[PDB]
Write a protein that binds this ligand. Structure first.
Ligand SMILES: CO[C@@H]1O[C@@H](C)Cc2oc3cc(O)c(O)c(C(=O)O)c3c(=O)c21
Ligand code: NA
Ligand SMILES: [Zn+2]
Ligand SMILES: [Zn+2]
Length: 227
């Protein structure tokens, strides 16, 4: 897991897919690593989630063209939080096509946050110059608008913050959560992606299909420890 900056780390899953970790300070939580993925194909790149601000985004964008030699032409945010579209303003200054769950669009619109240009309500297959990128909204969880991105040709699943990492014992920031549905949403995720090789969470180390079951119990535990 190489470093590309003082606050940005990279790991390589396959020849086309990468995962990055950007360090940032969040009032109330302190130093916290946020994950995102980079997908490449025929010199073009699709960025899933951006760091929390334009500086880290810019760095990350230049590293892609410099080390991977690819133009960032596509962006998909997991949901409306800072650790997903924090640096979308930058990306837009550079003409990047943005795609998101329609709800993410409405939330950013009313909160004066930069807005993505194409919403979907259930699913969206975005073609990165040939290579498919499948986005789905299977219900609320960490956030009401959260989606997942599936890569049919890599069996790699980007779950975002609806999925916690194996070393997590806390349910985390449930300020915009929909704990009522979260549990049902997780079931649909394991049902839909049985053969997932890699499963990347919004915070923490990646792993296999087991992060889904691990997160399912952190939540159930919470619904009852507070009920
Ligand atoms: C519990 O998991 C993580 O570990 C603890 C120590 C710190 C932490 O901080 C967070 C801060 C957020 O802004 C946020 O939105 C989440 C969140 O996604 O819930 C997390 C998050 O993931 C975690
Ligand atoms: Na991110
Ligand atoms: Zn979030
Ligand atoms: Zn998060």
């Amino acid at each position: 897991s190489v470093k590309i900056s003082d606050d940005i780390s990279i790991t390589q899953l396959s020849d086309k897919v990468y995962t990055y970790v950007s360090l940032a300070e969040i009032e109330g939580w302190g130093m916290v690593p946020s994950n995102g993925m980079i997908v490449i194909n025929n010199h073009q790149a699709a960025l899933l989630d951006t760091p929390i601000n334009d500086a880290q985004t810019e760095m990350l964008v230049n590293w892609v063209t410099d080390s991977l030699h690819a133009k960032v032409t596509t962006f998909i945010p997991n949901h409306w939080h800072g650790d997903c579209i924090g640096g979308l303003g930058y990306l837009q200054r550079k003409g990047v096509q943005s795609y998101a769950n329609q709800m993410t669009i409405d939330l950013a619109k009313e909160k004066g946050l930069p807005v993505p240009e194409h919403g979907f309500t259930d699913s969206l297959t975005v073609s990165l110059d040939g290579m498919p990128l499948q986005c789905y909204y299977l219900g609320g969880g960490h956030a009401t608008d959260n989606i997942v991105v599936w890569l049919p040709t890599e069996n790699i699943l980007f779950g975002g913050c609806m999925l916690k990492d194996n070393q997590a014992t806390s349910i985390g920031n449930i300020s915009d959560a929909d704990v009522t549905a979260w549990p049902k949403t997780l079931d649909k995720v394991k049902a839909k992606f049985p053969s997932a090789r890699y499963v990347v969470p919004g915070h923490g180390d990646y792993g296999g299909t087991e992060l889904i079951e691990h997160t399912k119990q952190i939540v159930n535990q919470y619904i009852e420890s507070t009920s």
